[PDB]
Every structure is written in structure tokens, then in C-alpha cells.
Amino acid sequence: NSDSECPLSHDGYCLHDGVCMYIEALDKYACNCVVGYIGERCQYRDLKWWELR
Numbered sequence: 001n002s003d004s005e006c007p008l009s010h011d012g013y014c015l016h017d018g019v020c021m022y023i024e025a026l027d028k029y030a031c032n033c034v035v036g037y038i039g040e041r042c043q044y045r046d047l048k049w050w051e052l053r
Contacts, residue, residue, distance in 0.1 A: 001025060014041050 004010070004021035011018035014031045019042075022028035033042030035049035045051045 015043055017042065 001024050002021075003023045003025070004019065006013070006020040010020040010031075013020060013029075014033055016037045017033035019032045020029060021032065022030035029041075031041035032038060032048070036046040037043050038045060038047050047053070
């Protein structure tokens with residue numbers, strides 16, 4: 001479904017960008033702020049781009 005529609009809330013649920021995407025009628029939630037904040041719901045490191053990748 002690519003369900004990431006939670007407008008002002010995607011950036012509200014989280015911190016330094018906030019993005020809500022994983023649900024998919026599975027009630028999932030991956031919250032991916034920015035390459036510099038990712039942990040459970042974006043708050044640890046730049047794992048995504050620099051640290052791990």
C-alpha cells in the first residue's frame with residue numbers, strides 16, 4: 001500500500017524530521033527522520049547513510 005500518510009503527525013510522532021512508514025494494514029511503524037537520527041523512532045546516529053552504510 002506504501003502507506004505513509006500521517007501529514008503533520010509524521011514529523012510530530014518523532015523528532016528531527018519524523019516519517020511514518022511501515023503500517024500497510026499491518027499496523028507497523030518505521031519512523032525515519034534523517035541520516036543522523038535513527039533509533040526505534042529516529043534518535044540514534046547516522047547509521048542509515050554514514051555510520052553503517
